[model samples]
Structures are given as C-alpha cells and as structure tokens.
Target: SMSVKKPKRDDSKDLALCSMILTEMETHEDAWPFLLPVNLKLVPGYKKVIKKPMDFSTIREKLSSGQYPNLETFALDVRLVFDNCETFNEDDSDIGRAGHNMRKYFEKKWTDTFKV
Candidate 1:
C-alpha cells in the first residue's frame, strides 16, 4: 500500500511477476508456463498456481490519504502483494491464505462501503 502509478489493464506487470514465480517453481519442479497466462492450454498434470488475490486493506489505507492523486489504488495493492510475497514459499500456504485474506479484504470493504 505504499504507492503505485496507475496500472494498465494488460498482462505485462502480472506477466513480470509471474515470471519470477515461474522461475522459482521451475527451479524446484518441471516448468509451468500456464500459471502466467490466462490463455493457457490445459493438459494432464497441469497444476494451476493461483495468484494470491490482491490485498485491499493496505490499498484502503494508502488511498485514504489521497496519495494516489494520479494513480489507481488497485495497482498499489497489486504491488504490495507481489513485493511482500517474495517469500512465496511454495510450501507456505500463501496461495490459500491469499485467497482467504483477499476475501476478507473485499468483504470488509463491501460492508463498510454499503454498511452491509
């Protein structure tokens, strides 16, 4: 939640982030290019490495200060998860924890935004 310039919606940043993760996975196991692309061709034994979803709390905190005057807040959060998760220990449950944390992130925002 530090700061991020607005992100273009294309896959470049995600691709770059994906590359680092793929390198880690490749070093440990067989290659897996599918995790990087949405257009991956499915096959047997393909383990889809899901990206831990974005963390919105940090996003909320940063944007609250109105620092992203020229940027989109979502990209800031994107950068946070990627940078903080360099310890993407495959054995660590970052994937599942990411999933749950992200859900918590959105749920809190939704509840607050609409007072649900």
Candidate 2:
C-alpha cells in the first residue's frame, strides 16, 4: 500500500516492485509449483484439472483466498515473469505479448472488482 499524503521514492518503489516479483515466484513455486511457467514440464500431473485455455482460475482462487494480497503488484509480478520468459526463451515471441496482455487482463479485473 502506497500513499498520496506522503509517497515513497520512485527508486524505492521500483525496488520493492522487483522484489515482489521474485517473492511471488518463490512463494507460488513452493505453494503451487505447477502454476509456474518454469514448471511447464511438471504440469502434466494436474494439467487436466486446469484444462481451460491459459487457465488463470488458480490465480484468481489465490487472490480470493488471501494467498495474494495486492492485485496491482501481483499483476506487475506476472508481467515481469512473462518478460523474463521472453528473454529466457531467447525471442520476443507472440507468447511474450500474450503474457503482457494477461497482466493487463488481471489489472482490468482487479480494477473492476475494486472500483478504485
């Protein structure tokens, strides 16, 4: 949570945002490893359970269940993951753009839910 009365420095905010992405990665990997993009090979066990195209139900569930506390920050973290994926895969592919759009989707949903 940031403030309008007294705001954090941009550099500090940026650092925290970067840290949030790594923290989300480690936490989600530990709690639900299959959901991580890095675990694409390990997804077969529960792939059937998550059959929808680019299923994000599990993430929504986590948000509802308090596993993720900040929608705005979490969306950024997911986008960062996608950015890293593009680099890791060695190409700025369509999937990378889709991932960016996915973050936008979450932000839209979050704003819709919060009306803020």
Candidate 3:
C-alpha cells in the first residue's frame, strides 16, 4: 500500500505582493474654492470634496510595516484607503488586482475575527 503525504499547512506568510500608484483626482489644490455653486442646496453635489490623499510612499510603508492597535482602527484605516478608489482610472493595470486583494483581505479578516 502506498501512503499519501499531505502537504504541510503553513499560512503565516503573505500571499502575494502587488503595488499600485494612487492617481490624484485634483492636481492643483489651489484651483479649488474658485466660486461656490450658484445655489448651495440645488446643486447635485457639494462645492468641495475632502479626503486624505493616498500617498504611494506612505501607503507602501504602512502596508509593509504599520501595525494596528485594534481591529476598529484597522478596519477604519483600510476602508479610508480603499473608499477613495473612485478617483483612480478604471483602465489602470494594477488597480483592479490590488483592489480585489484588498477587499478580500478585509472580508476574510472580518469574517474570521467576528465569527463566534
């Protein structure tokens, strides 16, 4: 009889390394506040948009080494980076893959962490 050796289960390492550049929607910060919409309430959206710009250098560093003190902070900060994904070009080569993995990470983490 031949015995089958099952593969070892070692999942301590990262699955993959994928990096992406964050495209800034607003190139000129000074161009903002030129004028308020004629009607504040009637406009489809607000006059200004505000968010923390995703600096690639900072993001890269944080992704590689930043440690969260708690689950709440981890979820909040991760969402902040991903929610701003709207500004990136849909045709970007790396964005889609990175986005997928990023979403998957949170989904799995949430499930694993919260499951009773």
Candidate 4:
C-alpha cells in the first residue's frame, strides 16, 4: 500500500517574524516611497531601469500567500526594494536617503532576529 511521506519542517515562526518586520517597515516614516509599486506615470522610465521592482506591500502579500520558502528568500525581496531605490535615486535625494535608512533598519532587525 502507498503511504504518504512526513510533512516538511514547520516554518510558522519564521513567517511570523517576517510579518512583524514588514509591519514595522510599513509604519516607518521614511517608508513612503517603498510602500507601494512605483508609479510609472509619475516616474517615467522607472520600469525600464528597475526590471525587478519590489516594495513592502508586495512583500507583505507574498508572505501572506506563503511564497517564501525560507527566511533567505523573504530577506532578498526586502533588500530589493532598497536596491531599486538606490538605482533610481540620488544618494542625497529624499527618497534615496529614506531607502538607505530603511535598509539599515531592516538589516539590524534581520541580524538581531536571525543572527545571520
């Protein structure tokens, strides 16, 4: 008789941690620019420059949908949002500075929680 294999390891804790981090990021004052997908109409050529655009809202949805198999994948997307900001804005600009600040905050939280 055929038998089912054991289920994979549980990652509910990791998912919860990811959700917590996202919530904090969304509430950050400098989170304005990365809150949603870039407005292509407002920022012409954004899509052309940033091929893989990412944001906090998209990450939240992905996390909710269980798209991230591990913490690494979740971290990657969070970093991508800041990376895209750096690519599209000047370091001295408001959005760019905010990106840098947000990335710093995320990294600190990541290291503190995951120790990696």
Candidate 5:
C-alpha cells in the first residue's frame, strides 16, 4: 500500500486509471495467453436482470466437487475474474486486494500491501 500516512491523491491516479483501461482494451488478446482460468462463461449470468460479481473461489470449489460435467465455459471464469477485478468500484479493502491479487504473480505479494 502507499506509505504516506495520509497519502496525497496524485493527479496521476486519473491518468493511470485511464491508462489501465487502455492497456486492458489493447493488450487482452496478447495477455490472454498467460491468463488463468482460461475459459468462457458457461451459463447466463451477465444478462441477468441483476448482475452478480464473479466468484472464482466458489467456481473452483464447485468444479472440484464435480457438480457440473467439466464445463469448458467456466475455465475463463477465473481469467474473467482476474480480468475484471479492476475498472470498478468496490469496498476499500477488496478494492486494494483485488489489484494486488490480479497484478502480482507472487502469491504473497499482497500480504504486505494490506499490512497483513
């Protein structure tokens, strides 16, 4: 996390946010090769009247339990999850965690960020 006791809001946050969007839109095709849960949606969730956030843990848990017949669609569930972790509003805690989780390849990379 930012070390400033009261971190100054950098104007670059806006610039960085926009850059992140452009980066996502521009690089998804190339990055997809290294993406995880590399599959697509298997069911009708997005078009629902009310949208729900993706839960990769739940998906992995269920998949491990073998409820669905190896749905190829869910593979991308993780990838899509990591994909959409940003570019939205969330609670402050998760908002931070989501960024570290998606952006860092190291499993423990986020521990220090949250003062964990």
Candidate 6:
C-alpha cells in the first residue's frame, strides 16, 4: 500500500522561531514592564491612553494560537508593545528606558534571524 503524502510548505518552523524570540525577550533584563499587561489599578489612565494594549504574554498566546499569519504580523504586535510604552511613558523614565532597550534588542535579533 502507498503511504499518504504531506505538503512541503509548513509554517510550524516560523511559529517556533517567533516563539524562541519571544522567550528571549521575556528573559531580558529590561523586559519587566513588557512581561505582562499594564496594571489598571496602578495606572488607571492606561486604559484610556493606549487603545491597543500589548505584552509579551499576549504575544505568546497569539503565537501559540496561530493568530499570526506571517512574521510581519507577529512583528507588529512586538513593536506595538514598545510604541505604546513610548506613548505613555517619559523617555528618560525607568519604564521608558526599558522599552527603548527592549525594542533595540528585538529589532537586532529580528534582523539577524530574518535579515530584514
């Protein structure tokens, strides 16, 4: 009997690569602020300011659920995390500094991995 054939093109590797990058970001020293969603209790105005709240945990869930169709979509969410930070925090502030550092790290890793 002949065995069934499988498709050659698969996105599992892409998802895995995204997951690996996320894991690295999560462990980074400056990743604290972006590790989880913002605390509404502490910063009540956060909800009003940032329309689309994003975090590493949220990105991880999206990646695991296959919500991202491609690397660009996945990268958008990662970038949003920092963009929101820039909008809400002061550039010289602790959280802002972290956000800047984290974004730099992510872009460098992304370029190295995808050459884009």
Runs of candidate 4 exceeding 4 Å displacement: 1-11
Residue-wise C-alpha lDDT for candidate 3, range 1-116, written one tens digit per residue: 26877785443322121212111211223212111112335533322442354433444455456444434444455455455443442425465445445556555655654452
lDDT of 1: 0.39
Candidate 5 lDDT tens digits, 1-116: 56647755443333333333324422433333223332346534433422434543445454556543432344344344544544332536554465444545322322332224
lDDT of 2 at 80: 51
When sorted by TM-score, best at the front, the candidate numbers are 4, 6, 3, 2, 5, 1
| Per-residue lDDT of model 1, residues 49-96, tens digit only | 434433334344444565454333444454445443333334246454
Better of 4 and 6 by lDDT: 6
How well does each candidate superpose onto the true structure, as a TM-score?
Answer: 0.28, 0.35, 0.38, 0.88, 0.30, 0.87
Best by TM-score: 4
RMSD each, Å: 15.1, 12.0, 13.7, 4.1, 16.6, 5.7
Candidate 5 global lDDT: 0.40
**Residue range with the least summed lDDT across 10 consecutive positions in model 4:** 1-10
Query: Which candidate, 3 or 6, would have the higher lDDT against the true structure?
Result: 6
The TM-score obtained by model 6 is 0.87
lDDT of each: 0.39, 0.44, 0.39, 0.91, 0.40, 0.92
TM-score of 1: 0.28
Q: How much is 63 displaced in model 6, in angstroms? A: 0.7
Best-fitting candidate, scored by lDDT? 6
lDDT of 4 by residue, 1-116 (tens): 26876776566689888899899999999999999989888889897899999999899999999899899999999999998999999999999899999999999999998775
What pairs collide in candidate 4?
none
**Model 2 worst lDDT window (10 residues):** 46-55
